[PDB]
Amino acid sequence: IWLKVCAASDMQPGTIRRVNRVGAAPLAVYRVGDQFYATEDTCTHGIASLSEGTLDGDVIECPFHGGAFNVCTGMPASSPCTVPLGVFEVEVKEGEVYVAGEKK
Amino acid sequence: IWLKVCAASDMQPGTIRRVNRVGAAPLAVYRVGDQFYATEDTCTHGIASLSEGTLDGDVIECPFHGGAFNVCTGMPASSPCTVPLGVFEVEVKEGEVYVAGEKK
Amino acid sequence: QIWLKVCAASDMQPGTIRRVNRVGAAPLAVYRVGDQFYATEDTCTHGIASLSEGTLDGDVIECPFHGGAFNVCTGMPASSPCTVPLGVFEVEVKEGEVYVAGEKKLE
Amino acid sequence: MANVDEAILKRVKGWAPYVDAKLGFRNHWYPVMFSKEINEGEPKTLKLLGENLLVNRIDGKLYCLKDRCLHRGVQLSVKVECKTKSTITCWYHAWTYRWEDGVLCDILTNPTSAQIGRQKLKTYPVQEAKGCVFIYLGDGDPPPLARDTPPNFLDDDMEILGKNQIIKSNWRLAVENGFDPSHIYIHKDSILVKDNDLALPLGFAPGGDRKQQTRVVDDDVVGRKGVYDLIGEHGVPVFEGTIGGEVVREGAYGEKIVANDISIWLPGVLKVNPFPNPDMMQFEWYVPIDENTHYYFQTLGKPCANDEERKKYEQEFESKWKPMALEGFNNDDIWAREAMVDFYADDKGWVNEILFESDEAIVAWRKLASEHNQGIQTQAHVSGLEHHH
Amino acid sequence: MANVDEAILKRVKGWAPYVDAKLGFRNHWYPVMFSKEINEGEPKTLKLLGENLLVNRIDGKLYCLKDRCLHRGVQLSVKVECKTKSTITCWYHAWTYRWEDGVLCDILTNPTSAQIGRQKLKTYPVQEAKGCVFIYLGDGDPPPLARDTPPNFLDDDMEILGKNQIIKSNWRLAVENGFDPSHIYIHKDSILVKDNDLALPLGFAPGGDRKQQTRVVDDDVVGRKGVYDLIGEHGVPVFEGTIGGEVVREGAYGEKIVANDISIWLPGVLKVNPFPNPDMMQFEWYVPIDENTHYYFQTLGKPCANDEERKKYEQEFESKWKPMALEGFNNDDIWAREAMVDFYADDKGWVNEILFESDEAIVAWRKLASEHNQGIQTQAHVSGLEHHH
Amino acid sequence: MANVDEAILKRVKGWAPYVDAKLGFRNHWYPVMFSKEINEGEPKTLKLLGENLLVNRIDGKLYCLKDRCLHRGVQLSVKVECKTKSTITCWYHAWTYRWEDGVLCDILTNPTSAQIGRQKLKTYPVQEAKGCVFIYLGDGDPPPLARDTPPNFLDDDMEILGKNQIIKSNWRLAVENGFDPSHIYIHKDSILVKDNDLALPLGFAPGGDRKQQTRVVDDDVVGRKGVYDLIGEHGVPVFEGTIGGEVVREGAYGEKIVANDISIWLPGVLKVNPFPNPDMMQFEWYVPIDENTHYYFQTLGKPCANDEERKKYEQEFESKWKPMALEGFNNDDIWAREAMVDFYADDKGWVNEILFESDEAIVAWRKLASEHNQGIQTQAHVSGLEHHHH
Ligand code: FES
Ligand code: FES
Ligand code: FES
Ligand code: FES
Ligand code: FES
Ligand code: FES
Ligand SMILES: [Fe+2]
Ligand SMILES: [Fe+2]
Numbered sequence A, B: 001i002w003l004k005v006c007a008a009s010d011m012q013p014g015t016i017r018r019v020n021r022v023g024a025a026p027l028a029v030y031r032v033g034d035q036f037y038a039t040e041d042t043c044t045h046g047i048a049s050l051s052e053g054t055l056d057g058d059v060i061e062c063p064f065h066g067g068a069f070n071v072c073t074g075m076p077a078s079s080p081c082t083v084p085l086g087v088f089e090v091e092v093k094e095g096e097v098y099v100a101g102e103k104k
Numbered sequence C: 001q002i003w004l005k006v007c008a009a010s011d012m013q014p015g016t017i018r019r020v021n022r023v024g025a026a027p028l029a030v031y032r033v034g035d036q037f038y039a040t041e042d043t044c045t046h047g048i049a050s051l052s053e054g055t056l057d058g059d060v061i062e063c064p065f066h067g068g069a070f071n072v073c074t075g076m077p078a079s080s081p082c083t084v085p086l087g088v089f090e091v092e093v094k095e096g097e098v099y100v101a102g103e104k105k106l107e
Numbered sequence D, E: 001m002a003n004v005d006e007a008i009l010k011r012v013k014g015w016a017p018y019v020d021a022k023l024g025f026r027n028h029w030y031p032v033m034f035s036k037e038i039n040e041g042e043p044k045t046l047k048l049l050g051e052n053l054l055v056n057r058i059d060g061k062l063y064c065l066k067d068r069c070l071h072r073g074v075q076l077s078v079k080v081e082c083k084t085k086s087t088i089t090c091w092y093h094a095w096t097y098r099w100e101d102g103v104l105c106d107i108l109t110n111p112t113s114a115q116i117g118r119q120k121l122k123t124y125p126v127q128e129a130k131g132c133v134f135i136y137l138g139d140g141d142p143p144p145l146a147r148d149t150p151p152n153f154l155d156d157d158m159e160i161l162g163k164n165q166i167i168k169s170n171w172r173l174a175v176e177n178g179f180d181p182s183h184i185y186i187h188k189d190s191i192l193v194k195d196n197d198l199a200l201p202l203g204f205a206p207g208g209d210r211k212q213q214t215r216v217v218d219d220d221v222v223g224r225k226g227v228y229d230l231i232g233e234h235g236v237p238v239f240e241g242t243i244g245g246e247v248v249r250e251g252a253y254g255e256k257i258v259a260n261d262i263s264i265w266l267p268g269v270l271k272v273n274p275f276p277n278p279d280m281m282q283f284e285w286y287v288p289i290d291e292n293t294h295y296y297f298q299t300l301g302k303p304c305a306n307d308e309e310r311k312k313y314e315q316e317f318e319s320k321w322k323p324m325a326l327e328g329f330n331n332d333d334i335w336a337r338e339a340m341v342d343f344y345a346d347d348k349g350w351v352n353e354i355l356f357e358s359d360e361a362i363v364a365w366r367k368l369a370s371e372h373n374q375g376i377q378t379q380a381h382v383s384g385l386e387h388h389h
Numbered sequence F: 001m002a003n004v005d006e007a008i009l010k011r012v013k014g015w016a017p018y019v020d021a022k023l024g025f026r027n028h029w030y031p032v033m034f035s036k037e038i039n040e041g042e043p044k045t046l047k048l049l050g051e052n053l054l055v056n057r058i059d060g061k062l063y064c065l066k067d068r069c070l071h072r073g074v075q076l077s078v079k080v081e082c083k084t085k086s087t088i089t090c091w092y093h094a095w096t097y098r099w100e101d102g103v104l105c106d107i108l109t110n111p112t113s114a115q116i117g118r119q120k121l122k123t124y125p126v127q128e129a130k131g132c133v134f135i136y137l138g139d140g141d142p143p144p145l146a147r148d149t150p151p152n153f154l155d156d157d158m159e160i161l162g163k164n165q166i167i168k169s170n171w172r173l174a175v176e177n178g179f180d181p182s183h184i185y186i187h188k189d190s191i192l193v194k195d196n197d198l199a200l201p202l203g204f205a206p207g208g209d210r211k212q213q214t215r216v217v218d219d220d221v222v223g224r225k226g227v228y229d230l231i232g233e234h235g236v237p238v239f240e241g242t243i244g245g246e247v248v249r250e251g252a253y254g255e256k257i258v259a260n261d262i263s264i265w266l267p268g269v270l271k272v273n274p275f276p277n278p279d280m281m282q283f284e285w286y287v288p289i290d291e292n293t294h295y296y297f298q299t300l301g302k303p304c305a306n307d308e309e310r311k312k313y314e315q316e317f318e319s320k321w322k323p324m325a326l327e328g329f330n331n332d333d334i335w336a337r338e339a340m341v342d343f344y345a346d347d348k349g350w351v352n353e354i355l356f357e358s359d360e361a362i363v364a365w366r367k368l369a370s371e372h373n374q375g376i377q378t379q380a381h382v383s384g385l386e387h388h389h390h
């Protein structure tokens, strides 16, 4: 079920970490300030890795075409993205980052 | 000769008032500050009603194409207008506005 | 002919240009940048314009024809469309008198 | 949204949205061809509101997909590959889409692609009515077709026959010319006038107030939006054209009275009744193809009680009405539209035009269109909507 | 009047108005056709300084109206309707104008319209001289034609003959080529050289100072403004062209001396004297049609005391001068002008050109034109002047 | 720079330089014609990177001068006047330049002009190799030609034959199509497949990670920069194309194995090996002419040890390879390129394209090109570089 991703301190504020999942699409864990969010890593508009994009507040900018999503709702924030990103609730307990097993 | 338009008090400065006449073309009355003026209501560049336009100082702008005239002289102030507007005499006798039946 | 008598250092105000015509030779342009004097060919290398009719901005002269420009000290282009360096002529002041070289400097 | 210089749009306060609508109004139904022009399993291409489209008939039903692959943007139609009854495969990298919903259901060049089932090619609703193919060039659930058609066009007993072609002028020039009360002057020498003994004035001397010159319909039982030209209600028909007092031209004194009522409706279809004969009606659309061209989709309707009358009507249409009216009368409208192209090409004609009385009809249409259109088609809709957070 | 990038105009400080005059100079007379090309009651179309015009001959006199109806901006010429001798009726809604003053005197589609007698279609003065039709493309009462013609063109005894055609290049490129002292090199193989035994150098080695290279005329009592090319007064003509000191080309050593008196005059007409023969003169205009084209109005003059000489001159013009000179000599000027189009098309050529000595003549012309033109034609003059506040 | 709207360039942070290079990359060698097409004293005109050029052969050697007179900017080629063996004289006012260094050495219309010997017309290095004419459209001393050529093109025994033509599409669309792993689908019906018994899949099911899909070359000793398409090293080739799980098309099961070694190199040349036959190689350039067109410079190489062998190859080339491969196989690439024109013409396609896995190869190329190109050709290079005194 829940996936133990990393220690909260393993990520500096404003950074993104790609989480590979054997037999499944990779995820992207974002650290916005002292909060953590997670979505599918692959941009819904192509093959770009959002973990290699630019984080502006709660909005992740795709490195390929400048499309963007709100990492909290997964909804597109900038064109050309039109397909909502899969979102995974995140929980931080005892300084450890956990991400829901399935989109939700 | 003269026609009863309205009470000088009924018109706030910077406003326009259309004066419909029986068996004749409509006129437009403008209150610029504390002075009143009158001209043909129909824009000389087309069939627009200047009373539906915008008054800026002593210049009336036609709603159709943005042409304009000086309400005091009736002379064109902005393109595409080129034909001077007909000006009519106004009189404020005892807090009451009157417009001349014919153009001065 | 080594040194050509131009004028008195006094006859020129800072930031001005003077044309020096020469018998059987192309005209020169003498520029006063502050209290220093410099000189180059007067004809713009980009065409037939007279640089002495241009505008001096510091140590850079702007041609009146197309807006090209040169650094008056080095003669190197400062603004397009100019691309060919100007010939530079040494200038010296002796006894308050301005003299310009009759031959341009070489490498 | 933003198709014309902002300085020009600021000047035409009476109808800025209309002037901006160079490419037409989005979210409306538009006729583009006749049902008989598209057969089972034979995809057809066309351009509507600047968008390249593909229409196919599968099991008798029509489907419409945007003719542009999601991958590298090529037109699928360059080399059509319909490998299964319900799909179309791009000739480039084999991305395959379902005609029914446009879903990217397969990719022959990479069956394991993560894109499969995760993308959708734009689809548009298509409906056939009266032998005509209508496409809803819009987003979301479409409104009833009746909203975008003139009254009676969809009447059960109304038999519709027509002709369609591409004309080189912006759609608005076509609409305005058709609804123009005084343009009747260009038809003074039409063969229809003489051959069908029509009464046809040269123009009209308006009567009454400007409000009485037109009748705007803001809502029908089906949400229709349009304007009726009532210049003839209190106006005086002009049958003798004079210059300096001398008669230089005369209208036509035929006995057949036609065009008692003329109305224009969004998205841009004119209804002339009765025309070209007292027992018929004419409905014609000026469909935006791009900023410089439109489909001139002409139709003539006549109530027919049985197959017998429909047969006779069809014969009369082909032998007389199509050549004498649709062509013999309306051909003059075609070059008239083309004649206004230059003046409005730089968008400056919308400011410099000098209108006169009968243009109250055109002004009413411009305002109605500006206030009730369902959306302005932009170049961005064509290339891909843009938005930056 | 902003026809070119401001950054470029800022760079060409010596002649910015000229560089900005891409559409030509307004308020000057321009020849557009020959008298024999416009017949009584047969209106003719043409474009001058970007404006579409119509010329008509009524009772032998010429009249010019702008070919654009005030109403919806269509060209009246699409379907000419001159219903009375003194008027023209627009084919669209019948707005009728008087040829003599452009006043909207009638409207057949609505004889009660308030526009009648209140609007006026733009008119332009027209004058015929020497069998040539000149139009004053300007506003207000026109100056005398002589102001915009070269000296002697209007001489009583001067018989004028010529030809006109449309050339694909901006008018300025044609003017500069014509007044270009060194371009004579492109004529070294002209049939006129051998066939008319002319003396013709390949170029000129200039002599004297800058001022001596030309004679700027700004004191002409008639108001004429122009420049004389005086490169040959102090220069040594080149008859032996060399490369590496080796002669590779020779000029023409014929006995006929020609083209020793060349001058250019606003608005853009060249005078070559004597040419193509020692007893003749050539006057040619480069009239702006639009930013990419001009009329190459060629005329040859020869004093004639009577009909006998006029017939003889006419015969030689047709059999020799026109084919051997106007075409045999000037044809090379046509493609030479076209060859410069690309370099100046983006306005960059006005900055990047690398001039040499003989171009002093062209520079003098650019300055004269910049300082003495009567106005800069703008696209707004074409669509409709614009002004706010 | 300044070729594309800045708003668009800001969006494609991964390869902005490449998207901006609509006119191609300056300071690289480019083939423009075959040696046999330019004869002694027979100047030829051509446009490369938007610039009009003139090429001539003098005493066997090739020289290249910009086809635009310094004076009034006309093309010297409108009326060529080569009055002496080492010079060309403008037909307008006779400014004369030396083919060897472009120096304005004489002016027939004014032998006393001060411009003489003080102006220089732009010249570009020209080199002939393998029967191909290469022009270095750049400034300063040129690098070795080998830097801008694919490996083996210059091998001693490699006999090169080819065909060249002008195609109506931007050069980048041609490059991407050529290096596009999955575009192989458009060639499924080529006469070359059946007529030369080729094994040709319909596509590929990628395997492994991103890094493994290609091999970026930036360590080559000659300085060449390029990318190898390794999609087939972990990917399973597709021979059965399915829709809804049902087979609707199959690939080719021929015996000859080809094109399992594909690489793209700056400035824009593809190498397919072996192709179109197991004992041959194909090297093709997509040379920028202007923003809308390119030269499709095709060459086929085959090792030959002597005149007898290279002659046999030439005959096979004319009777089979040219019509069956260069045309029979690549003609489909031509219209495929043209098909992408509209989408990218407004520069919006660079933002709106929806890529899938195999495009990993194209992305790698876009990144390599953006990082290792030697300069962006701009419209200013064409009209005249501009600079304002700061
Ligand atoms: S791949 Fe992310 S915006 Fe296109
Ligand atoms: S109708 Fe008033 S500006 Fe045109
Ligand atoms: S002549 Fe000086 S910049 Fe051109
Ligand atoms: S462009 Fe259609 S599958 Fe690639
Ligand atoms: S456009 Fe001429 S009368 Fe209407
Ligand atoms: S344009 Fe070449 S010498 Fe003048
Ligand atoms: Fe009509
Ligand atoms: Fe000439």
Ligand SMILES: [Fe+2]
Pocket: F177, F178, F183, F184, F187, F330, F333
């Ligand atoms: Fe291919």
